[PDB]
Amino acid sequence: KETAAAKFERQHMDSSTSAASSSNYCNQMMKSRNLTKDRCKPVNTFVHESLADVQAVCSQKNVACKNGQTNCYQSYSTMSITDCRETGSSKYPNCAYKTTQANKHIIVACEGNPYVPVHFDASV
Incomplete structure (x- = not known):
């Protein structure tokens, strides 16, 4: 099954863009990353x-x-x-x-060896 680390990347990382380019960014990304498949996250x-x-x-x-x-x-x-x-x-x-869009510190939970993010806790 998908690892927690991999889930974090799918749900939370977008290294492909520097910021949201339009009001439809979330609509498209929530869909594309499968965060709307079974219910609306x-x-x-x-x-x-x-x-x-x-x-x-x-x-x-x-x-x-x-x-x-x-x-x-x-x-x-x-x-x-x-x-x-x-x-x-x-x-x-x-x-x-x-x-x-915002520019904030992030708070993540980490687990494993390598010790990597597994959960996005907050933007602060």
Whole structure:
């Protein structure tokens, strides 16, 4: 089955673009990354950075996750991110999202050897 690390990349990484280029970015990416296949994922963040730069966060500032786990890390630097959240009209299978671009620090949970992101916790 898909590993947690691979799931993180599919759900949260977009090294192919430097920022969201239009209001339809989230609609298209949520679909393309299969985040709308079985239900409309309510909220999601994409990170417009290299994979290595995001993986490196696992060696940056430790902080407890929202759920209390202690394997979370905040990036030292801000990153280009896109916030995706369902619009009021979103209704499966016609999932619909508001695209918001931002430059924020990220907080990720990490696991494994290599020690890599497995969950996106927050943009801050």
